[PDB]
Design a protein around this ligand. Structure first.
Ligand SMILES: Cc1cc2nc3c(=O)[nH]c(=O)nc-3n(C[C@H](O)[C@H](O)[C@H](O)COP(=O)(O)OP(=O)(O)OC[C@H]3O[C@@H](n4cnc5c(N)ncnc54)[C@H](O)[C@@H]3O)c2cc1C
Length: 311
């Protein structure tokens, strides 16, 4: 099955610009849930679920964009008014998990609150939209807005470009979409022949997301895909400290900077708390090479090689 999967409808490749704000909070699109499944094992710190939504082709999007979801209920801050929209990176390609251009998928981490002293959960303080989504069942309706976002659109001008993707937790979402388009789907107008390098940081092996899918790419395209996993609570860096993504980046610092100097695109997606540590590491490596990171970063942004979407 090393052959690419047929996708339809191909007219989704005809759009010159990505759709933006097709639906707004004022009048959202009522989509329907197809399936919801847990992506993690028993040892994971929290639950992360995969949700497939049927939009019937009414809310098309491009890889890297986000869907807005308006949970039911009233705005706890504004009685009578609807809940605020919560954004979620789309984890599927424009064709969707069913390869028919009718569905989109979300990768959602259940936000739960535990009292730091007693350690007991308090449902009244849990995340409204994330729990609403992972508690959903087939047939349930969901209010969708968007799509939104242009920061994470995939640069396709060069089919042989290099893309270095760095994610933590649910930040892997857009990359699942990128990778399916690059290696799984039969898209005649985009034949990827460059290098895709995915770095994924999670708590432990039971918290890995879509591992079987990414591992399959390693076996099928050894010369075009690299995959490095970082399990914070199971691995230690060269110092006895907890292993984080920036530690793995430092290990490949020489090759990564060579690729960046060569025009590679670098992406960061996931929880914002991941950036401080990465920035410090990149700064150190840059100065080691004799360069000012502030100046190199300014150049990367000017060249449109720097893509960041954290939350
Ligand atoms: C561009 C973008 C992309 C995103 N992509 C994803 C994605 O792919 N996957 C994903 O899971 N998320 C993603 N998010 C985050 C998502 O939009 C939500 O912020 C997240 O799901 C939490 O929403 P919520 O409705 O569950 O929680 P909210 O109800 O908004 O609550 C926020 C937090 O407050 C806590 N809280 C509430 N009341 C109290 C209280 N009294 N005391 C203490 N704590 C309290 C909740 O437990 C929760 O952790 C993205 C955000 C952006 C901007």
């Amino acid at each position: 099955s090393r052959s690419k999967v047929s996708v339809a409808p191909l007219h989704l490749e005809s759009a010159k610009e990505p759709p933006l704000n097709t639906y707004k909070p004022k009048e959202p699109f009522t989509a329907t849930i197809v399936s919801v499944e847990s992506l993690v094992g028993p040892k994971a710190p929290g639950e992360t679920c995969h949700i497939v939504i049927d939009h019937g082709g009414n809310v098309p999007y491009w890889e890297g964009q986000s869907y807005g979801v308006i949970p039911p209920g009233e705005n706890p801050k504004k009685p009578g008014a609807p809940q605020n929209v919560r954004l979620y990176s789309i984890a599927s390609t424009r064709y969707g998990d069913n390869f028919d251009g009718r569905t989109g998928s979300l990768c959602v981490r259940r936000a739960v609150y535990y009292d730091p002293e007693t350690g007991k959960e308090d449902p009244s303080k849990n995340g409204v939209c994330s729990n609403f989504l992972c508690n959903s069942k087939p047939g349930d309706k969901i209010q969708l807005t968007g799509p939104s976002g242009k920061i994470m659109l995939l640069p396709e001008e060069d089919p042989n470009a290099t893309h270095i993707m760095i994610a933590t937790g649910t930040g892997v979402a857009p990359f699942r979409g990128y990778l399916r388009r690059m290696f799984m789907e039969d898209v005649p107008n985009y034949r990827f022949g460059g290098l895709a390098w995915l770095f994924l940081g999670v708590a432990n092996s039971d918290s890995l997301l879509y591992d079987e899918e990414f591992t399959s790419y390693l076996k099928q395209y050894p010369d075009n895909f690299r995959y490095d996993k970082v399990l914070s609570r199971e691995q230690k860096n060269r110092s006895g400290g907890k292993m984080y993504v920036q530690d793995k980046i430092e290990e490949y610092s020489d090759e990564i900077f060579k690729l960046l100097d060569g025009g590679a695109h670098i992406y960061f997606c996931g929880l914002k708390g991941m950036m401080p540590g990465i920035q410090d590491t990149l700064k150190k490596v840059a100065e080691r090479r004799g360069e000012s990171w502030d100046q190199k970063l300014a150049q990367l942004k000017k060249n449109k090689q720097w893509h960041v979407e954290v939350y």
